[model samples]
Target: GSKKAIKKERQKLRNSCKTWNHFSDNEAERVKMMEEVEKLCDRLELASLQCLNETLTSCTKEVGKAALEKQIEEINEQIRKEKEEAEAR
Candidate 1:
């Protein structure tokens, strides 16, 4: 349940990053883009933390823990890649 929600939110952030390409000369547009990026980052951080907390609290079995850890790693990697792409633009 929580994992699904986390994944959905993560994908939402990735899609937002992918679709965003506002290269303009206007200061207001630049500020808006910065603010939007900040909001997306905040959302991603919150979702990641929620997933980590869930794993720590609920994943009692070794197999379950391992699975959750892998899930987290993938999520982190995806976010990292998206961030790098965003930065490169």
Candidate 2:
């Protein structure tokens, strides 16, 4: 239940980012979008870290440490890509 709620809230944050992209094109809007994107990305990173910790704790026996490490690496990679994409625009 907690995980589902976290995921839903993250989705709402993501939707706000999409909304920012759709409306407004002035300097203020761009700055606002950048701020919102940074905030949302931080939220996403935290949520993903929480999820990873939970998964690791609950399934340590079923999953290897290497798998968890790879997942974390992938999340960081995505964060890097998202930041670069946002900055490039």
| Collision count for each candidate, in order | 0, 0
Q: Taking the tens digit of each residue's C-alpha lDDT, what string does model 2 give over 18-86?
A: 343335455574454345434444644556655654555555433623344455456656776886887
lDDT of each: 0.48, 0.50
Model 2 lowest lDDT segment of ten: 13-22
Tens digit per residue, CA lDDT, model 1, 1-89: 12355455545533332333233355574344335434434445665645544554455545434444455556556666787888898
Error of 1 at 48 (Å): 2.7
Model 1: lDDT of residue 24 = 37
Q: Model 2 compared with the native: what TM-score?
A: 0.41
Global local distance difference test of model 1: 0.48
Candidate 2 residue 57 Cα shift, in angstroms, is: 0.5
Best candidate (score: lDDT): 2
